[PDB]
Amino acid sequence: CHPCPWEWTFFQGNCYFMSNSQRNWHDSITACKEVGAQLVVIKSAEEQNFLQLQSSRSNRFTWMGLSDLNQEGTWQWVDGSPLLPSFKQYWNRGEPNNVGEEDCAEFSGNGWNDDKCNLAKFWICKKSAASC
Numbered sequence: 001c002h003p004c005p006w007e008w009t010f011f012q013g014n015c016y017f018m019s020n021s022q023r024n025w026h027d028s029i030t031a032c033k034e035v036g037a038q039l040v041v042i043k044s045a046e047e048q049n050f051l052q053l054q055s056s057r058s059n060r061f062t063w064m065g066l067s068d069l070n071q072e073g074t075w076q077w078v079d080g081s082p083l084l085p086s087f088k089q090y091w092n093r094g095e096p097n098n099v100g101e102e103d104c105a106e107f108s109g110n111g112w113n114d115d116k117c118n119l120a121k122f123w124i125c126k127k128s129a130a131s132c
């Protein structure tokens, strides 16, 4: 019994997978659903640090499951949870700036950026671990 499928990274009771290909934000959501997972929704500061380190180290621009599609300037996670005030620190300086209408959040450098949802980027899926 192992807590995560092969190639998935265990962290604090959940399993994470960073793609080796790029898709747009909606196709990224689908990709995660297809493996019984979810375009990553971040619930803790420790989790955000963990994900940002890997995005920074890999130098990969990476979708997270966060958007202000439904109402501009109101960011919501894909599980419906609202973006809490304790998460505003992570936006890069000058972001979110919605330049050219940017409605999907990404790991970019040391923090978060809003970018065009049609852009192809890597993505991270999250599902819970088995117990063993």
Ligand SMILES: NCCCO[C@H]1O[C@H](CO)[C@@H](O)[C@H](O)[C@@H]1n1cc(-c2ccccc2)nn1
Pocket: 061, 094, 095, 097, 099, 102, 106, 108, 113, 114, 115, 116
């Ligand atoms: N992972 C992306 C790394 C590059 O980040 C820059 O370009 C992104 C793509 O556009 C923007 O979404 C970012 O906000 C950022 N940017 C552009 C701009 C800008 C301001 C005025 C005119 C043109 C661009 N101001 N700040």
Ligand SMILES: [Ca+2]
Pocket: 068, 069, 072, 101, 103
């Ligand atoms: Ca919009």
Ligand SMILES: [Ca+2]
Pocket: 068, 072, 073, 096, 098, 101, 102, 103, 104, 114
């Ligand atoms: Ca926006």
Ligand SMILES: [Ca+2]
Pocket: 095, 096, 097, 098, 099, 102, 113, 114, 115
């Ligand atoms: Ca931006």
